[PDB]
Design a protein around this ligand. Structure first.
Ligand SMILES: *[C@@H]1O[C@H](CO)[C@@H](O[C@@H]2O[C@H](CO)[C@@H](O)[C@H](O)[C@H]2NC(C)=O)[C@H](O)[C@H]1NC(C)=O
Ligand SMILES: *[C@@H]1O[C@H](CO)[C@@H](O[C@@H]2O[C@H](CO)[C@@H](O)[C@H](O)[C@H]2NC(C)=O)[C@H](O)[C@H]1NC(C)=O
Ligand SMILES: *[C@@H]1O[C@H](CO)[C@@H](O[C@@H]2O[C@H](CO)[C@@H](O)[C@H](O)[C@H]2NC(C)=O)[C@H](O)[C@H]1NC(C)=O
Ligand SMILES: CC(=O)N[C@@H]1[C@@H](O)[C@H](O)[C@@H](CO)O[C@H]1O
Ligand SMILES: *[C@@H]1O[C@H](CO)[C@@H](O)[C@H](O)[C@H]1NC(C)=O
Ligand SMILES: [Ca+2]
Length: 399
């Protein structure tokens, strides 16, 4: 019904994939989720939670017919989730995770129903607070929280609550203190993207790793350290959960080329930071810290991860590099997963990310490129995603 077009060289779809721009003019759209009524809720950062009414003509033929601001709150900056029954919306500021009653008869939120479920999350620099509600354990809410600086010493202290993911049984609800949740992982500089694999309920996160990396004082920031895919075990069990994934004393290797003191290190292995606390060595990184399951190209900046219904594929948004001479990212990629809920690629792979939508000319980014942020599936397996810098929502599907 509406003719919406991109204002930059359009994304390139891999063979077998098609897409359509369905919404424009949003302020800075981040997390997105469908409600029970087929409306798309958008966390529009600096505005609040917006609901988009869609007409669906099938395939990529969707049009926005109306938009409404459900929750007006300029402090909401990224995180959004909705209960499986559709009656509770969760959204986060830098400091607080709020729960609101959502009236799906009227598609309204009464602001007086707001309650704080998690608090004390405030810190500088990395200010997003991703929310994930478990499907396998529907009363479990995961909350991710990044570092206070590029290299944050408080991330060494687990009680600070910096650079870690926590889980809360919201059925047991004054709000939880952040560090009162179950520890899913710490030493996670800024793992904005957190998802659950339906094959087995495995918890996965994607990492925005350190900027300005040095190795024996040599600048190796152009191609290191890699971005990471981290595994946190099964929700409710302790196996492969609650460890320290290395920030800020250990980083993962992406590019071996010209890397000082490589030794026995391979792609995917973690090595000690030049600025690691006194006494930490490469060996400490091997024995005491948890390595990533897979690494990606340095600085692609992943922001969300969503699995399809079968659990055969995860989709990841690469929001794009900001400080690399030639830009990288600005894409949507897929990673293949096996029957045991783990990636089919080995941990030393440099080719695990398969291109779904890419920018045609990375030299133009980020000014003339989309910057994917949030993903969500609808009930029939179409993928929807936000581009915050461009104020856009897209639909994506196999043709
Ligand atoms: C949401 O709906 C409002 C109201 O229809 C839209 O605001 C209009 O935007 C158009 C340009 O697209 C203007 O020409 C109109 O004057 C605006 N109307 C009003 C009353 O403000 C808004 O653009 C829509 N936004 C989204 C994201 O759908
Ligand atoms: C790690 O972080 C925790 C955060 O709780 C620090 O504990 C606080 O320390 C400040 C300053 O010493 C005190 O004013 C608070 O009373 C402490 N809070 C608690 C819960 O006791 C701790 O000092 C930091 N250092 C560590 C523990 O290594
Ligand atoms: C280790 O910490 C030092 C902190 O000094 C970092 O070195 C800084 O790197 C930038 C280059 O991007 C220089 O402009 C600064 O001048 C350097 N030191 C300062 C601020 O005086 C180094 O990047 C860190 N190495 C990492 C993160 O691997
Ligand atoms: C186990 C199984 O049914 N595998 C399917 C796969 O063939 C299909 O390509 C995919 C599409 O998302 O969904 C899943
Ligand atoms: C948040 O931290 C303060 C200490 O700074 C603590 O007293 C409070 O209990 C924490 N949050 C809640 C609501 O427990
Ligand atoms: Ca790590």
């Amino acid at each position: 019904t509406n003719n919406l077009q991109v204002t930059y060289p359009a994304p390139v779809a891999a063979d077998g994939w098609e897409y359509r721009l369905i919404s424009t003019g949003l302020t800075a759209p981040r997390s997105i989720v469908f409600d029970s009524t087929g409306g798309l809720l958008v966390l529009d950062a600096g505005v609040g939670v917006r609901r988009l009414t869609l007409q669906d003509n099938g395939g990529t033929c969707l049009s926005v017919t109306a938009n409404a601001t459900l929750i007006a709150d300029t402090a909401l900056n990224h995180g959004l989730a909705i209960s499986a029954d559709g009656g509770t919306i969760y959204a986060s500021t830098v400091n607080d995770v709020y729960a609101y009653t959502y009236n799906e008869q009227t598609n309204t939120v009464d602001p007086t129903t707001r309650r704080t479920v998690v608090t004390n999350m405030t810190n500088t620099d990395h200010v997003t607070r991703t929310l994930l509600l478990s499907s396998r354990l529907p009363n479990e809410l995961l909350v991710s929280r990044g570092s206070a600086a590029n290299e944050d010493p408080q991330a060494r202290n687990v009680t600070s609550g910096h650079s870690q993911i926590r889980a809360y049984d919201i059925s047991t609800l004054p709000p939880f203190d952040f560090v009162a949740g179950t520890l899913i992982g710490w030493g996670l500089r800024d793992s904005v993207g957190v998802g659950e694999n339906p094959t087995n309920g495995g918890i996965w996160s994607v990492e925005n790793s350190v900027d300005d990396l040095t190795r024996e004082g040599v600048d190796v920031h152009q191609d290191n350290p890699g971005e990471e895919l981290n595994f946190h075990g099964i929700l409710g069990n302790t196996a492969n959960q609650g460890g320290n994934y290395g920030y800020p004393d250990c980083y993962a290797l992406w590019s071996t080329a010209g890397f000082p003191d490589l030794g026995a290190l391979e792609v995917g292995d973690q090595f000690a930071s030049d600025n690691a606390t006194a006494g930490v060595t490469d060996a400490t990184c091997n024995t005491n810290f948890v390595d990533p399951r897979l690494v990606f190209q340095a600085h692609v900046s992943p922001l969300d991860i969503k699995f399809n219904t079968n659990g055969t594929t995860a989709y990841i948004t690469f929001h794009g590099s900001t400080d690399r001479t030639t830009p990288v990212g600005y894409s949507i990629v897929s990673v293949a997963f096996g029957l045991n809920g783990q990636p089919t690629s080995p941990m030393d792979s440099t080719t695990a990310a398969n291109n779904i939508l890419t920018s045609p000319d990375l030299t133009q980014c980020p000014d003339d490129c989309f910057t994917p942020v949030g993903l969500t599936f609808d009930t029939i397996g179409r993928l929807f995603f936000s581009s915050d810098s461009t104020g856009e929502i897209f639909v994506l599907q196999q043709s």
